[PDB]
């Protein structure tokens, strides 16, 4: 369905799974890790966000502020980031290196230069 979908948006950043970004990947499965997102004006939390090839990645984004996008250039990731609301995105990453991550919702001044960064290990 899944599991998260609703979400504070006034306490995301004190309390809760996005609240620590050092512990923002968290292993949920054998092979599968959860990676709590925090999309803001103007970049991404963690960053560089930092995976290993192969296993099942499943995204968990959402917003303290105000719309975002969450696009992984050179993959089909694309959803928006809405406050209060948790976006879920899974992916397995099949090849190691940096991936770039975009925002593609106008969401202020900062737009342009909102970039985050995934590194997919060996
Ligand atoms: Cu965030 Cu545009
Ligand atoms: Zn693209």
């Known amino acids: 369905a899944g599991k998260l979908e609703r979400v504070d948006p006034?306490?995301?950043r004190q309390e809760g799974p996005?609240?620590?970004?050092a512990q923002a990947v968290v292993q949920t499965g054998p092979n599968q890790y959860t990676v709590y997102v925090?999309?803001?004006?103007?970049?991404?939390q963690p960053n560089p966000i930092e995976v290993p090839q192969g296993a099942e990645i499943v995204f968990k984004i959402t917003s303290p502020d105000v719309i975002?996008?969450?696009h992984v250039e050179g993959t089909n990731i694309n959803?928006?980031?809405?406050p209060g609301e948790v976006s879920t995105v899974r992916y397995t990453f099949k090849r190691p290196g940096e991936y770039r991550i975009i925002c593609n919702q106008y969401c202020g001044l900062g737009h342009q230069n909102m970039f985050g960064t995934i590194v997919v290990k060996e």
């Open 18 to 21: 996005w609240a620590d970004p």
């Open 38 to 44: 925090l999309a803001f004006a103007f970049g991404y």
């Open 79 to 82: 959803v928006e980031v809405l």
């Open 10 to 12: 006034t306490t995301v």
């Open 68 to 70: 975002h996008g969450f």
